[PDB]
Amino acid sequence: KHLLQTVLHIIQVVISYFLMLIFMTYNKK
User: Fold this and answer.
1) Phi, psi of 5 (to 5 degrees)
2) Which residue in 28, 9, 27 sits closest to 19, CA to CA?
3) Cα angle value 1/10/16 (rounded, 5°)
4) DSSP string spanning 1-29?
5) CA end-to-end span of the chain, whole Å?
6) How far is CA 4 from CA 8, 9, 14, 20, in A?
7) Burial 12-25, CB ≥16 within 10 A → b, else e
8) Result of mutating residue 24 to L?
9) Among candidates 7, 6, 26, 8, which has minimal Cα distance to 18?
10) How far is Cα of residue 28 from the mean position of the Cα atoms in its chain?
């Protein structure tokens, strides 16, 4: 049941790996 139960963790890394790039851009000192 709940196939997202995992995807959630997946989207976690990616996002956790993307934000690190976004934040830099959306940092807007």
Assistant:
1) -35, -30
2) 27
3) 145
4) --SHHHHHHHHHHHHHHHHHHHHHHTT--
5) 44
6) 6, 8, 15, 23
7) eeeeeeeeeeeeee
8) Reduces copper(1+) uptake. Reduces copper(1+) uptake. Reduces copper(1+) uptake
9) 26
10) 19
CA distance 23 to 7: 22
User: 6: which 2 tokens?
Assistant: 């995992």
Exp. method: NMR
- Six token digits for residue 4: 């997202």
Please give the structure tokens belonging to residue 20: 């690190």
| 28, two tokens | 């807007």
CA distance 12 to 29: 25
